Design an enzyme around this catalytic site. Sequence first.
Site, PDB file in Angstrom:
ATOM      1  N   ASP A 108      -8.248   7.612  -0.768  1.00 22.97           N
ATOM      2  CA  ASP A 108      -7.145   7.794  -1.694  1.00 22.97           C
ATOM      3  C   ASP A 108      -7.705   7.654  -3.101  1.00 22.97           C
ATOM      4  O   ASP A 108      -8.566   6.808  -3.347  1.00 22.97           O
ATOM      5  CB  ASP A 108      -6.038   6.771  -1.438  1.00 22.97           C
ATOM      6  N   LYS A 109      -7.228   8.486  -4.023  1.00 24.04           N
ATOM      7  CA  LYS A 109      -7.912   8.604  -5.306  1.00 24.04           C
ATOM      8  C   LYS A 109      -7.560   7.460  -6.251  1.00 24.04           C
ATOM      9  O   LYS A 109      -8.425   6.662  -6.624  1.00 24.04           O
ATOM     10  CB  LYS A 109      -7.580   9.947  -5.954  1.00 24.04           C
ATOM     11  N   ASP A 113      -4.515   2.110  -1.156  1.00 23.92           N
ATOM     12  CA  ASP A 113      -3.959   0.912  -1.769  1.00 23.92           C
ATOM     13  C   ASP A 113      -2.489   1.046  -2.140  1.00 23.92           C
ATOM     14  O   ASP A 113      -1.956   0.171  -2.829  1.00 23.92           O
ATOM     15  CB  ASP A 113      -4.772   0.536  -3.009  1.00 23.92           C
ATOM     16  N   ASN A 117       2.409   5.023  -0.289  1.00 24.22           N
ATOM     17  CA  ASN A 117       2.358   6.377   0.243  1.00 24.22           C
ATOM     18  C   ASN A 117       1.199   6.566   1.209  1.00 24.22           C
ATOM     19  O   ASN A 117       1.157   7.575   1.919  1.00 24.22           O
ATOM     20  CB  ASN A 117       2.259   7.387  -0.897  1.00 24.22           C
TER      21      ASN A 117
HETATM   22  F1  ALF Z   1      -3.237   9.991  -4.616  1.00 17.19           F
HETATM   23 AL1  ALF Z   1      -2.943   8.234  -4.392  1.00 17.19          AL
HETATM   24  F2  ALF Z   1      -2.669   6.469  -4.172  1.00 17.19           F
HETATM   25  F3  ALF Z   1      -3.583   7.932  -6.040  1.00 17.19           F
HETATM   26  F4  ALF Z   1      -2.306   8.545  -2.742  1.00 17.19           F
HETATM   27 MG   LIG Z   2      -2.759   4.668  -4.307  1.00 16.44          MG
END
Ligand code: ALF
Ligand SMILES: [Mg+2]
Lengths: 324, 815
Positions: free
Chosen positions: B383-384, B540, B543
């Site tokens: 996750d980014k 983290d 979602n």
């Molecule tokens: F793209 Al995200 F937490 F930053 F799912």
């Molecule tokens: Mg996130």
Amino acid sequence: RPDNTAFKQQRLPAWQPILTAGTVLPIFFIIGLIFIPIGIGIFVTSNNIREIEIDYTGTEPSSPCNKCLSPDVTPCFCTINFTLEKSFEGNVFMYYGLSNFYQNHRRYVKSRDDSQLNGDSSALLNPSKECEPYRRNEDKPIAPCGAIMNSMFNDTLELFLIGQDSYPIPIALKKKGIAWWTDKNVKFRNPPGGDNLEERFKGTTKPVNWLKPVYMLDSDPDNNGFINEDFIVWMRTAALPTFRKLYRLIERKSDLHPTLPAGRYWLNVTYNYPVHYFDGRKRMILSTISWMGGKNPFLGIAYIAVGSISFLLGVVLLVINHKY
Amino acid sequence: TRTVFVGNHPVQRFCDNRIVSSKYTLWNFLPKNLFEQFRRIANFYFLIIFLVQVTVDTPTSPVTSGLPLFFVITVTAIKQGYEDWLRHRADNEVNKSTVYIIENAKRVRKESEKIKVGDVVEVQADETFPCDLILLSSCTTDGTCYVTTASLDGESNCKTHYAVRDTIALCTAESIDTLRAAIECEQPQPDLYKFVGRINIYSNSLEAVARSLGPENLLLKGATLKNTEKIYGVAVYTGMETKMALNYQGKSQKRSAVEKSINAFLIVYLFILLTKAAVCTTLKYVWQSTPYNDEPWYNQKTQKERETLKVLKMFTDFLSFMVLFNFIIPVSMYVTVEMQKFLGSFFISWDKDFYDEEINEGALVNTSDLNEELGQVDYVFTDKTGTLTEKLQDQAAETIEALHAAGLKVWVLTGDKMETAKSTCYACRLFQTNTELLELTTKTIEESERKEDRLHELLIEYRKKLEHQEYGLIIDGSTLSLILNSSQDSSSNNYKSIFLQICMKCTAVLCCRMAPLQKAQIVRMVKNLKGSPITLSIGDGANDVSMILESHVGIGIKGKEGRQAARNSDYSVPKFKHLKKLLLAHGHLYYVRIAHLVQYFFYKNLCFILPQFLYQFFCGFSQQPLYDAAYLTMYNICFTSLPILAYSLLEQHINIDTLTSDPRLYMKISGNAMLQLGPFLYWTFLAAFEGTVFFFGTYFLFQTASLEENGKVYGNWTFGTIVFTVLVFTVTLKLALDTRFWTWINHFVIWGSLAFYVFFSFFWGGIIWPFLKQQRMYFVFAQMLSSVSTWLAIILLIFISLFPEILLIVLKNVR
Ligand code: ALF
Ligand SMILES: [Mg+2]
Ligand SMILES: CCCCCCCCCCCCCCCCCC(=O)OC[C@H](COP(=O)(O)OC[C@H](N)C(=O)O)OC(=O)CCCCCCCCCCCCCCCCC
Ligand SMILES: *[C@@H]1O[C@H](CO)[C@@H](O)[C@H](O)[C@H]1NC(C)=O
Ligand SMILES: *[C@@H]1O[C@H](CO)[C@@H](O)[C@H](O)[C@H]1NC(C)=O
């Protein structure tokens, strides 16, 4: 915040051995040079053990005991002439072997009452239910209950050496000392009450196959019942359908004479035990012992076979790394 | 296609705002768990053998089959019942909240779970929404609203929604004027960016105003309101239908690769046990066809075994042969995998390298049942924002290299927009300079069938004809919906296959603008292809809870957002860089410790029962146990239980300070190597070869008429005590040749388990108690040891047996 303990951090001090070809191949030589000497040692020893077995089952009209395979007026006797080539010098042990006799069957191995034979008065009068259908007879508890006991071996074998003339001279066989010291002095005891034995077995009955109660096996008061060595020896099951049970002890003479000189002998047997019903065979084994027991080539041939197969694979892969 | 009347006032079949994340009711937990457990083949077999021992025939005792089977049930139902009760405790804090509703010209206040479709809800500033609203107005004019959807797309920027034009004037001023309207909406869908509706505002006399509704009016659920004092919505989707509740997918159950092997080994040893019992029963009645082979005048059946129906004893003998050989499927392997998992999981919590002084916390183990799955990962779905970037994190680029050096494929599933979502990956060392981007974003597929061309222009002519370092894929939530969802139209060349192949041949993949469920539909496409890749997902945010629940092992970072993903995951590290040490060092060790305990538990019991199966050919197939009931019972409890439990809890197969320095060592255990068909047939033949040296090595030793210098014969309890001394020393020394990390606890348990079998054999044998109905082993171990030819036969048989293991070492150590 996190406990910085050696155990908790998975950082205990360890030994971490590194075994490798260059470290193990010397082990293939320590084995070869220790297993071949031992193998020849216990293979030569098993060959200096004199022995003879006289199958006296009958079953062939050319045998003396064919009159005892199905007798009519039978207290039955035999006489099986046999000859010793080379004398027996040390201690000699007379055995009797049974073949096709399943002393290790499950319904059989358990048909005993270990507490009754241990001199227990509570169990002496109400034997267990494992020893069935040999638990009671004519509404009385059988003294030694069980099938293991009921089928005790009851042949009488006596050897005779025929001197220079035809006169046969008997050999002295001793009955004491043939059962584990522990299961005669500890594990097998008599009923506690009194010094006379016939009255310790009062509300009991002799086994069905017996001919004399268990207090009449011997006259010796220390070999009389539940401690008889012949009884105690038959009670120790066999572990295979072809077994041998120690019978007598022919002891070495005070002089250095031969325990059993060579020549012709007589095996006089009272043929009591029937074994042809289930295609069994009865034999007598006369043997001498060594530090390793009877005569069994397996253990010698197995140390040579494994001491040579290991001393070769050591050389095989030792030179294969000498390719450099 | 659903008609909602705004104020519930006229100008039904809707859910009621109640999220249900739990699986069991607190009333029907036992009937539903004891069925999910005893429906397995392992737990159902243990119960069928325990019922036979209690009913037909047992060699040792029924207490040693029902006690471990009860511990293994009660312990799995506490884990599964607590891990589920924690979801009730979480469903309640989301329901039973305060939400002010405008019922009748006044500001009522119910709880969130009591909202109904079509009732004016009011949300204050910084208040999560109780459902998928339809912004009707705002206390201030301009009909705006600033929402932050940090629980739907993981980002934290101020989105903007627009209230309906005709209703932006209603601000606590007759908002309850039986306000005539009818919000005609579409059925609930998980798209999270598509919403087509229609409203029919009515006037004082009669009106026809119909203003189109779009995703700019729908205030989704779980989106905090920002910089706005108060708004007014209309619940349209309430509970289990809110777009946040449609992207959940639930947690089904997670089994390791080692627990799916334990189940294959148990179905192999289930046919080895039915053949041992069906071969011994067929032979038992071919042997008894001779009248003197049963009842040969020296042991006779009483009267009840002569009368027992012929066919009733054939089935009862079969059960007596299974209760005799039942030891080859060990109930102690499940009792020991529980202690090992629970105890071994304490090394992640205790690790001082998984410690962050910022948050002042360390790692966290929510489920100890996947320790051995941290060492089998093939794909890593990240996750980014929050996981990789905070700019990148401390070592988000040095951890992605150590994950490629180990042979994993790192994909980045994000919810941010591909503009900034892509820039980061260029800094994480995941997208190199000379890497051609194969993009399927919406800025490339502005057509209907155009992408079908792209999936070919990128697969059949661009990437699969060749270079494993050059191409990297990029996708979009808008496009992935056409590939994933619309893959049931064509079957000659399916989009989901033409596209799945482009991913496995690409260096790295990046999916931008993903909804919470699309992260779980990508992680499930990988779980299906070409075998069974083991997937790991780390995020983290809230979602990320849907891909953290869908993967094989889900790691939840402990970060700024909250502990929503930290409590739905299996493990929890307060950093991304802690993933290198978590699966390279901890995952490698955890797998090798449990994959050897499984191989050794099955081997260790075939050496034990094979001598006892061969023994039947020498009794009348009478089911006579070779060993004493005190040895049968203590083999897996005392004599061989401790050494393999300390091997499973402290054994560096490779020094852990070296496991983290060399990630290439991860590939050695990559495809479940230690539990494959190769290593399984080696252990199963070692045990069938040793079990034949034990019995037949002593079968020939017993052809001598005596093994003592006093000429005294041994019985059948010494035959089996010699087979048991060769067996305990062989299986204990086989594990001393496998041990490579000798702590003071390994010396104690390995050399102490041997010194205890000897001390116990002198203790149990040597006294008449009396509390037993038999005294069969009284002096068997003491007499057996007074013969020199028995010391040698035992030294030779625990060398012939350990030869294939000492010989295999010299082979695995040269050329
Ligand atoms: F793209 Al995200 F937490 F930053 F799912
Ligand atoms: Mg996130
Ligand atoms: C919040 C979540 C909570 C989760 C909590 C999990 C934490 C677990 C904590 C540990 C508790 C342990 C409780 C053990 C209960 C076991 C029941 C039990 O003992 O039954 C006996 C079992 C029997 O196994 P089996 O022989 O293969 O099967 C028999 C065969 N099927 C038959 O026919 O009947 O035998 C076994 O199952 C063997 C079990 C392993 C034994 C290991 C312990 C050893 C005990 C000490 C032995 C002393 C030995 C001393 C040696 C000297 C060393 C120095
Ligand atoms: C022993 O052997 C011979 C063989 O016929 C027999 O005649 C003799 O009577 C036997 N001796 C005794 C004492 O029974
Ligand atoms: C010897 O044993 C057999 C079989 O048990 C029995 O038939 C016979 O009566 C016994 N003879 C004796 C005790 O002299």
